[PDB]
Amino acid sequence: DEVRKNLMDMFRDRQAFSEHTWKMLLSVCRSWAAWCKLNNRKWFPAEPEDVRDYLLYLQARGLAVKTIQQHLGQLNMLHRRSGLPRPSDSNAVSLVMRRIRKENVDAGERAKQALAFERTDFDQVRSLMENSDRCQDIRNLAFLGIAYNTLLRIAEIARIRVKDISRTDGGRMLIHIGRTKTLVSTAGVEKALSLGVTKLVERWISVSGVADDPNNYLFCRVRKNGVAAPSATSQLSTRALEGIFEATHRLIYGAKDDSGQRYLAWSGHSARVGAARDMARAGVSIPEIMQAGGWTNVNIVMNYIRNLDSETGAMVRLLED
Amino acid sequence: SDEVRKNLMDMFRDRQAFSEHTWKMLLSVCRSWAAWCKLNNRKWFPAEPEDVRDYLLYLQARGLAVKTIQQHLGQLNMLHRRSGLPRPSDSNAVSLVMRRIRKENVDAGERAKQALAFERTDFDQVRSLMENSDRCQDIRNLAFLGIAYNTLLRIAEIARIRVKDISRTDGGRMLIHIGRTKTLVSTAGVEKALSLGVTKLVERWISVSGVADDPNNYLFCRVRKNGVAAPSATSQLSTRALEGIFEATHRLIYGAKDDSGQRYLAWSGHSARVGAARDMARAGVSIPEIMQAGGWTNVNIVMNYIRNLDSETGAMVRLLED
Amino acid sequence: SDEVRKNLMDMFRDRQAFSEHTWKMLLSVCRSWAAWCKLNNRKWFPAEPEDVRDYLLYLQARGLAVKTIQQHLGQLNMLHRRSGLPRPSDSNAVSLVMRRIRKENVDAGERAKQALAFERTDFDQVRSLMENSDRCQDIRNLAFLGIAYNTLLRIAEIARIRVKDISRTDGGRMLIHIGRTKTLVSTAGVEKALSLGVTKLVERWISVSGVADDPNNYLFCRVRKNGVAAPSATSQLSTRALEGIFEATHRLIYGAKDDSGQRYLAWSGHSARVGAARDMARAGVSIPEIMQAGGWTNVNIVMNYIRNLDSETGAMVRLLED
Amino acid sequence: NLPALPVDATSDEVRKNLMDMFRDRQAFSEHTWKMLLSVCRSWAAWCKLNNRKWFPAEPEDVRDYLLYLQARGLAVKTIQQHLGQLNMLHRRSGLPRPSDSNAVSLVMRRIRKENVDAGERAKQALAFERTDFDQVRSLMENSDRCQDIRNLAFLGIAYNTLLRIAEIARIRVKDISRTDGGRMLIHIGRTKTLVSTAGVEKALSLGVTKLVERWISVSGVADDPNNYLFCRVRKNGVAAPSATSQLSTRALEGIFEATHRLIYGAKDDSGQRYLAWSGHSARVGAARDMARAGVSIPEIMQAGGWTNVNIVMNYIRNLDSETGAMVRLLED
DNA sequence: CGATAACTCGTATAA
DNA sequence: TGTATGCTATACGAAGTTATC
DNA sequence: GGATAACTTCGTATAGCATACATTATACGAAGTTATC
DNA sequence: CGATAACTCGTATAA
DNA sequence: TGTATGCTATACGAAGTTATC
DNA sequence: GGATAACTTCGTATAGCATACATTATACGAAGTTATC
Ligand SMILES: [Mg+2]
Ligand SMILES: [Mg+2]
Ligand SMILES: [Mg+2]
Ligand SMILES: [Mg+2]
Ligand SMILES: [Mg+2]
Ligand SMILES: [Mg+2]
Ligand SMILES: [Mg+2]
Description:
It is classed as replication/dna. By secondary structure, chain A is mainly α. Chain A has 14 helices and 4 strands.
C-alpha cells in the first residue's frame, strides 16, 4: 500500500546509484522472482523463510560466497528503499549465511585476483610490438604503457581524451584526470607518463589523428584494414580494453585451457597488481604505493604483494638470522 | 509534544557541551532553512521529509558545494534526533535525494579542494628570508610557521598554547602540551615535540616578546605598528590572524594573488598540515608514524591528505625511467 | 513456550553456522546442568537465577577452575538468549556470584595455566637428533614441529593443510595458505611463509610419503608400524595425534612425564605458539610484527602470550648488572 | 554499611536486589566498596544540605551535584568516579541509572570540556630512575641503622622488580629462592589477576640481592619462613617480624617520601601531589631507564606487567627517543 | 591367530 | 580472543595506636 | 605518668588498569579400531 | 585630528 | 574526523553489429 | 554474395572499495576597533 509510494520515490531519484548497481539489482530480482515462481513463493515482500531456502539454493548452484552476498544484498536494498523490513534482519537468513560462508570456505572455496602484469611483462611486450607499424600494434602498446604507468582503472583509461593531455617541461606528458568518480579522489588529479611511455603514446596520437578534435577520446576503434576511426561521442568500450590485455597475453603464451578458471590471462587490473608488486620489490613505502594507485585500504595492496620474499614475516627472519 | 520541548530545553541549557562552531552552524542552517521554509509556506519543525528534499534540491540549484549541502542536511538531522523525533534522513525521500545530489555534482566535474601545501621547500625559503630580521612581527611569524609545520597542529590548537604548556626534553628539544584538539578532549593531552632548529625559533620569539613574564600568557599574541609585542593571558591571537600570517607570508614571496575569487590561492591555516603530510609520505615514513604526527587514527584520512608529487612526479615515473 | 520452541529449532537447523566444539560443549553443559537439576528437584529451563547460582556455587564446590565455571554459565546464557529469553546472567544474583567465585579463587591462589614453551632452542635440539633419521615418521614429525614453530599455526589449522594450499616465493620458500582459523572464516585467508631451512624439512616429508600424488591430499597423514605413509583427502590427521607428536618429542628428550596429574607437564598443541611468541619478544620484534605472526589483532593478547625469562631473567637485571 | 535505604523510599525489589548485592558482597574489591561508600556518604550529605531525596536519585539533582563537585574544583576523573558509583548503586538495585538521561549525560560532557579548556591535566608519579637509586645507595649503603638497611632493600626491590607497593608488602621469606647465578628470585603467588600478565617470579640483580640479604640477616625475618619480607622497626631501631601483619602500603609510600626528603629536603609548601617519590615512582623511572637503553615496548611492558601500551607510552613520552617523524625529517 | 604400533569421547580448561 | 570503561589501585593529610625513650 | 618514633586506620581525591560478552580451541586419559608383526 | 598598521561575523566548505 | 558493509566496478563467454577482405 | 576483423551489447559471476553518521574545524571578504604614526 504505502510501500508503492516509497517505490515511486525510490525511482524518482534512481540517479542516486550507478547504472551498474541497477544492473545487478534487476539481474538478481529477476533470478529471485524466477526461483519463487517455481516453488510457489511471493517474491515480494520476501519472507525470511523463503529467502533462506533461496540463498541455500544458490549455494547448491555452485555460486561463490561473494555472489550469494550480492544477491542477499540487493534483495535488502530493495526492501529497505520501501519502508520495509530487510531479509537480513531476520534470524533465519543471517543464520544460514553464517552457515554457508563457513560451509563454503571450509569446503575449500577461495577468492582470487587478477594475474599480475609486471615490468618484466611490459619490456617483453615492448620488444615484440615495438618495431611494428600497424595502426593497432601501436595503439595497443600505448594502452599497455598507460595501464602500467598510471595504474588507472580501465573505465578511467577509456574516458581520457586529448584535451586532458598536456606536457611537462621535462618532456613528459601529463594526463589530466578530470571527472573523477569520488568527491574526495584518493588518487591524484593528474597522472604523468614516463619518458618512454610518453613517446609511445605520441606515436599513437599521430598515426590515429585523434589529435584533430580535442574532445576526441584518446583511444578508439581500429578496423580490420589498419585505420583508426577517432570519435568524441563513443569511447572504446571497457570490454575491448580487457581484450587488448587478453590478446597480448595470448600472443605470448598461447590460448587458455579448456578449463573455466578466471584470470588465466591478463585483465583490466593486471596492470595495477603488477605495478604494485614492482614498487614493492623496489622499496616504495606502503603510503607511497597506496597513493600511486589511489588505494584507501591497505589490505588490498598487501594482498597483491603477499607472496614477495620481502613480506615473509618476522619468524622467517628470526630462523635465518 | 511534552518530551520534545523537554529534550530541547535540556540541550540548550547545556549547549556548552558542544563546540561553539557546532552552535554557529546549527543556527546558520536553521535561519537559512526557516527563510526558505517561510517563503514557500512550509512547516519548518518538525521538518516534513518531502519539504527537506525540496530544500536540499533548492540548495543544489543555488550552486552550493556538495559538502555545504550535507552540512545543512546535517544540522537539520542533529536538531531532530536531539529532540527525540525521527530525522529527515530517516526517509527514503531525503536519504536518496542526498545521494543523487552527491552523485550529480561530482560528475558535473566537482571535487573537494584542500589547502595549498606549505612544504619543507617553502619553509627553508621563508626561513632564510626572514631568518635575520630583528622585527617583532617577523621573528614571531617565523616561529608560528615553524610550529605550524613541525607539529601539524591546527591553527585553533596553536592559538591556545600557553607558556606554561611548554617544557623540554633532556636533549634540549622543546615540548608543547596540547589539551583539546578537533578530535580529542581529555586531561591526558598529547605532547608535540619541536626540532633543535624550530625550538630556537620559538626561544627567539619568547624573549623578544616577553611572554614568559606570566606562565599563563599565550605563546602568540599581537604586535602593533610600533613593533612591540603585546602579551596577554586572557586574549589569544585569533585563528583569523594565524591564517593571515600564512596569506601574508605567501603574498611576500609571490605577491598579489589572482582575481579568480577561487579558494586556496595562497597558503591558509591547513597548508603546513597538508604540506608536512606530503613531505613525510614522500620521505617513506610509515603509516603509523605519519598518523601520530598528524593526530590521525586511521589510514583513511592520512591517505585523503595525499594528492602528491607532479612535475616529474615520483614513484612509477621515477621507476620506468631506468 | 511456542516461539521459544521455534527459535531453538531454527538454531538447531543451521546448527552448522557454529563451531563443532561450540555445540559439543553446549550439550555437555546442559547434561551437567540437567543432572544436578534433577537430583535437586529444580526445573532446567528457563533456568531460574537462584538455581543457576546454587549450581555455579556447586561447581566451585566440586573444585572446578574459574575458566571452566564461566564456560558453563556462558553456555547456559547462549541457550537462553539464542532462544529469545533473558540470560540468567542478566540477573543481579547470577552476574554477582560469578564475579565472586572468580575473586575468591584468584584471591586464594588459583591461576591460569599456559602451554609449556617450545622455543627455538628446543627446536634446534629436536632437529639435530632427528635431522639425519630416515624413518618415515621421524621425517614427518620433524616437518610438523618445523611448521608449528615457524608459523605459530594451531594444530587444528595445521591438520587441515592440503598440498594444493602450498606455493612458493621466487626466493624458493614454501608459502602455505590457511583459510579457517579460530578467529576468522573468509575466502581471503592468510598466507604463512616458511624459512628456507624449514621449507626443506617439508620438501622432504612430501616426497618420502608421496602425499603429493593428489593435490587434494592433507599435507600430514598417519604412518603405520611398518613405516609407510598413508595419504588421504577425506581424513585429516587427528589433532589428538598432533598433541601426541609433541609429547612424544618431549619424552624423546626428558624421559617420562612425572606423575603429578597436572597439565602442561610436557609439550603440547600450543607449545609452538607460546614458544615462538616468546622468542620473538626477546629478539626485540615489534608489537605489530608479533601480532602479525600469530594472528592476533590486539596488544592485549600478545602480552597475554608472555610471562618471560626465568632465573637471571633479562631487562632490569641486565640493566643494573651492566 | 550504606547511608540508609529508606523505610518507604527503597520500595519493592530494589530491596530484593540490594539484598542480593550484600549477599555476594565478595564480588567486588574491598577498595571498590570503600569508594562506593565514600561517594554515597558524599552525595548523601550533599543531599541533606540541599534538601534532596538521596535515593533513588532524580536526574536534575544528580546534575546539580555534578556541577557542585566541579565548582568545588575537583578533577574530572574524580567527578567521573562519583557519577560512576551512583550508577553502580542504581543499576545493581534495579533502578535506571543517572547518566542514562539527557540532563546528566549532557552536563557531564559539558563539565569535561569546560575543565580541559581550563587547563586541567592529569598528573603522574615523579620518577625514581637509576641515577636516583645510585645516589640514594651511595649514601645509605654506609648506614648500620636497621631502618636504613630495610629502606634501601625496599627501594632496591621496587626499582628492580617494578612491583606495586601492595605486592611488595606481600612478599614473605618463603617466596625467595636462589639462582645458580647466586642472586635472589622472588616468586609472586597471590597475583592480582587470573592471568598474571607480569609473570610469576622476579629476579633481583646481584647488587640488589646483596642489599636484601643484609636486611634479612639483621631483621631476623628468616626465623619463620612464613614471615613477611618487610616489617616495622621502632624507636630503638629493632625489627619486628610477623607472619600475620604486613607493612601497610602507607608505610611503603612513607619510605619513598622520606628518602626524597633526605636527599632533596622538606616538601614544597603548595599542596600539589607528586612533589616527592611515591609508590609508583620506581615503575615510572624503570620504564624510562629501559626506554633509554633501547628496550622493545613488548619487553618493557612485560618487565612491569603492563598490558596496555598507552600507559608506558605516557611514561616515556618526553624522551628524545620519542620525538617523532617530523623532528627526524627536519634534522636532515 | 593374538599381540602391537599408531591412531573417538567426554570432561575440563584455555584462547 | 578484542577492549572500551567499570571496577580497583595508589595519594596523602590527619587521626588513632603501641612500644620506647 | 608524658613525649615521641614509627607505624596503622581513615576518608576523600585520582591514577590505572582488567573483565563481561559469545563463542571457538585445546588437554588428555580411556576406550575403540585398523592394518602389521 | 586624520590616516594607518595590525587585529568580529556570516556564509561556505573541509576534516 | 573513523569503519563495518553496502554500493560499484571488473570478468568473461556469447550474441549482436558494421565496415572491410 | 559470403566470410571475417574488431568491436558493441548483454547478463551473470566476483572483486574492490568508499560512504552515512554527527559533529568540529577551517576559508575568507566585509565591517568594526584600537593604539600609533
Ligand atoms: Mg549527512
Ligand atoms: Mg580505598
Ligand atoms: Mg632524575
Ligand atoms: Mg630513611
Ligand atoms: Mg626531585
Ligand atoms: Mg623506545
Ligand atoms: Mg609522627
